[PDB]
Each structure stands twice: as structure tokens, then as C-alpha cells.
């Protein structure tokens, strides 16, 4: 199933023409290799919701009340 479809590759993050003062992210390789710096793009903010845990709907109350030598011995 995976053998079908096209699939596209990704590119490098160029300097944002809409953000000259954009921040830069630097990744340094310990095993030689040159340090790379890329423009740190900023994700748009998404409005969050207050943290609540899961619960079940309800309309009436709901009462809550709160050697292994047997087969081996027989075979032996």
C-alpha cells in the first residue's frame, strides 16, 4: 500500500522575508561537522482551554460499593 502515492521532500528554512528580526536556532555537532544556524520560525498561538479531567454524564445518582501446587500436584 505504501508503494503508491507521490510523497514530496522538504526544503531548508530560508530567512523569512516577512521577519528580518526573527530568531535563529543553532545546532552544534560534537563529532566534527560545521555548526548550522537556521531561522527559528514562530508558530501561531492557539487559544487553550482550562484543564479538566474526564467525567461521565449523569442524571440520577449512582451508588458505588467498594506454589501453584493444584494442577501440578494432581497430575503428579
Amino acid at each position: 500500500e505504501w508503494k503508491q502515492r507521490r510523497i514530496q521532500p522538504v526544503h531548508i528554512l530560508t530567512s523569512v522575508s516577512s521577519l528580518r528580526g526573527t530568531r535563529e536556532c543553532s545546532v552544534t555537532s560534537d563529532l566534527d561537522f560545521p555548526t548550522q544556524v537556521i531561522p527559528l520560525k514562530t508558530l501561531n498561538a492557539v487559544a487553550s482551554v482550562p484543564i479538566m479531567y474526564s467525567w461521565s454524564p449523569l442524571q440520577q445518582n449512582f451508588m458505588v460499593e467498594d506454589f501453584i501446587n493444584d494442577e501440578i500436584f494432581v497430575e503428579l
Binding site: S18, L19, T22, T42, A45
Partner: peptide, 10 residues
Amino acid sequence: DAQTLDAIRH
């Protein structure tokens, strides 16, 4: 947020 702030800074 930050995207609008970054654009305004640029």
C-alpha cells in the same frame, strides 16, 4: 502573540 510581534519588529 509572537508572529504578529515578529512581523511588527521586522
